[PDB]
Amino acid sequence: MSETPRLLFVHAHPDDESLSNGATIAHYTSRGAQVHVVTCTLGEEGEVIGDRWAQLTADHADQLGGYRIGELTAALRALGVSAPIYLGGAGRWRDSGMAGTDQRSQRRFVDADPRQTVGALVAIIRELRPHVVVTYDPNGGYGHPDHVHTHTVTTAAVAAAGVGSGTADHPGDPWTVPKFYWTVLGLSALISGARALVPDDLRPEWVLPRADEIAFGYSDDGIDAVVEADEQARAAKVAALAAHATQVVVGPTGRAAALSNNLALPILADEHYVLAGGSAGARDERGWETDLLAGLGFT
Amino acid sequence: MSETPRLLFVHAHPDDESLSNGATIAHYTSRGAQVHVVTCTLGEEGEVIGDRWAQLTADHADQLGGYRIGELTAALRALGVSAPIYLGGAGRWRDSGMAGTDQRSQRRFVDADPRQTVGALVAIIRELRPHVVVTYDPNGGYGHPDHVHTHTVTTAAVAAAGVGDPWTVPKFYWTVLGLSALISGARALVPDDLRPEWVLPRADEIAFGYSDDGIDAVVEADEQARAAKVAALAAHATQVVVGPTGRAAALSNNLALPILADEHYVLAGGSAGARDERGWETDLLAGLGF
Ligand SMILES: [Zn+2]
Ligand SMILES: [Zn+2]
Numbered sequence: 001m002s003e004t005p006r007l008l009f010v011h012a013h014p015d016d017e018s019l020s021n022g023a024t025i026a027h028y029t030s031r032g033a034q035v036h037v038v039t040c041t042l043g044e045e046g047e048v049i050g051d052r053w054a055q056l057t058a059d060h061a062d063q064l065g066g067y068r069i070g071e072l073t074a075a076l077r078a079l080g081v082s083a084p085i086y087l088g089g090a091g092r093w094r095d096s097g098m099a100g101t102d103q104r105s106q107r108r109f110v111d112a113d114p115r116q117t118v119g120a121l122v123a124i125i126r127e128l129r130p131h132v133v134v135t136y137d138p139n140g141g142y143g144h145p146d147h148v149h150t151h152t153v154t155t156a157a158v159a160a161a162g163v164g165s166g167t168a169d170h171p172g173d174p175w176t177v178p179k180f181y182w183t184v185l186g187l188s189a190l191i192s193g194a195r196a197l198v199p200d201d202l203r204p205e206w207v208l209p210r211a212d213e214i215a216f217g218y219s220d221d222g223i224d225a226v227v228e229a230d231e232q233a234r235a236a237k238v239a240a241l242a243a244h245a246t247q248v249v250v251g252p253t254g255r256a257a258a259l260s261n262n263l264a265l266p267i268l269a270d271e272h273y274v275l276a277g278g279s280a281g282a283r284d285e286r287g288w289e290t291d292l293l294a295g296l297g298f299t
Numbered sequence: 300m301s302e303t304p305r306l307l308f309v310h311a312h313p314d315d316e317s318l319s320n321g322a323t324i325a326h327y328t329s330r331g332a333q334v335h336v337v338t339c340t341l342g343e344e345g346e347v348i349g350d351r352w353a354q355l356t357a358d359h360a361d362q363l364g365g366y367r368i369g370e371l372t373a374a375l376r377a378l379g380v381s382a383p384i385y386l387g388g389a390g391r392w393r394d395s396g397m398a399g400t401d402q403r404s405q406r407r408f409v410d411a412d413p414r415q416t417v418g419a420l421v422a423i424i425r426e427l428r429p430h431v432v433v434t435y436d437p438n439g440g441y442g443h444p445d446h447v448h449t450h451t452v453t454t455a456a457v458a459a460a461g462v463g464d465p466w467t468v469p470k471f472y473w474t475v476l477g478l479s480a481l482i483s484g485a486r487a488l489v490p491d492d493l494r495p496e497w498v499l500p501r502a503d504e505i506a507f508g509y510s511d512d513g514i515d516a517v518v519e520a521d522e523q524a525r526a527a528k529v530a531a532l533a534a535h536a537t538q539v540v541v542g543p544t545g546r547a548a549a550l551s552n553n554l555a556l557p558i559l560a561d562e563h564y565v566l567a568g569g570s571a572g573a574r575d576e577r578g579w580e581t582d583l584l585a586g587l588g589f
Contacts (some may be wrong), residue, residue: 068368
């Protein structure tokens with residue numbers, strides 16, 4: 001274990017950390033926890049909002065990933081995290097592209113040698129020795145191929161990290177992650193969130209989404225934990241999303257945001273999780289932990 | 300010619316603005332002038348110093364140009380310039396690489412249609428109406444293909460901008476290396492100015508230095524401007540490292556170079572103002588009535 005708590009979030013693209021776990025990250029950094037984010041790709045295949053950087057996309061100059069390094073860096077800082085960590089090194093494994101898009105590249109993350117991807121993340125785990133690790137559920141949240149792959153890699157890495165390896169002269173330093181969570185979308189919290197939005201929250205060109213285009217929400221019964229952050233944490237999440245300016249636009253009141261598809265989304269203080277490995281601590285009347293560190297003895 | 304002076308520097312790659320003109324840019328912005336820099340490529344084909352960003356290069360992830368946007372932005376801000384301007388839009392025309400090289404892209408600046416490149420720069424000039432424009436000499440300084448191309452495009456644009464909305468650039472300069480100042484700067488360096496891996500230069504590693512009689516103007520830096528130049532170079536961390544005393548720097552080849560605040564120019568168009576005992580203007584704006 002040790003004295004200051006340590007948490008690790010493993011994501012696919014720049015912005016995933018803020019969209020999924022921004023409020024949770026800021027929550028824990030503000031309480032003196034050591035939090036790191038690992039990002040598995042630079043996001044080379046992203047769309048761009050606005051004209052200024054529009055020629056950086058893969059179908060033009062194809063330089064978007066390098067630009068998003070600065071966005072990620074600023075977003076992490078807003079969340080209280082000091083620097084990005086790109087799996088295998090910045091630029092190692094390329095954004096694999098949205099589902100269904102047939103993509104040309106011989107460096108795609110989904111195609112990468114599991115020995116290398118898993119090996120890279122085992123090293124990070126063993127170095128950082130996180131008490132909590134967080135990543136996507138098996139369907140990668142909304143089904144993005146890198147999200148699914150990030151889940152597969154991270155699951156395998158968590159399993160390998162605590163197992164003895166290395167040679168007689170170079171023994172591994174194994175670390176068994178105490179608690180392993182999937183970050184997931186809470187269906188009910190989202191409905192509540194969308195329903196609380198007023199026209200003043202939206203930009204004129206944004207459309208509210210209907211049931212069908214949203215999406216893959218867990219029921220309260222499928223959820224094991226929540227971090228219910230305060231307004232200071234939520235405002236950090238807002239600032240982190242604003243920093244990903246090519247990817248995400250925050251509305252006039254900071255209550256809502258939208259990606260390039262112009263679907264308005266609420267920016268919530270509550271973030272939900274499924275416990276995939278380890279022992280739960282105390283659960284409330286919903287059956288949820290209210291602290292990812294629960295049972296680990298920091299309180 | 301509004302009485303606030305307006306200056307435009309046209310460069311090939313991120314860092315060229317600070318290596319060539321950093322002190323001059325800071326000198327003028329600190330004095331309330333309107334200064335802009337146009338950068339013609341993102342520098343996609345650059346090498347990288349250090350391991351952190353090493354896989355960004357064109358023979359790995361090929362994403363370095365997008366990363367260098369932030370380096371340029373920070374460098375510009377250290378010089379008092381609020382934002383980068385990439386010719387034709389960020390990413391329009393690619394870094395063409397060193398001479399002799401070597402690439403898959405057909406978006407190279409050197410191969411670009413003159414109508415588009417010159418057209419783009421003409422629009423910027425008519426928009427900014429600079430009193431002074433600066434770019435490389437005809438050999439592009441040290442001969443980088445993009446630097447030669449930048450000179451060619453800028454020269455064509457300056458000529459075209461004032462022909463029938465039109466702006467005739469009052470004064471057009473080439474930024475050049477001063478031979479004498481480079482020799483003296485190199486000589487003044489001591490091993491403490493360098494980092495472990497760097498090599499002190501000699502009479503050998505010079506090349507394209509202009510003589511004092513071939514120079515028309517100098518902007519002599521005060522300490523605030525030199526310090527801004529040093530901060531700007533430092534911001535281009537993938538390309539340039541400043542030494543421990545801030546008096547020397549080196550690119551990826553590890554050849555130490557003095558950080559010479561005094562920057563020299565050849566008047567390529569327009570009329571000179573007052574010259575000093577060296578035969579040099581000491582202000583690019585000389586004779587324009589500010
Ligand atoms: Zn993603
Ligand atoms: Zn250059």
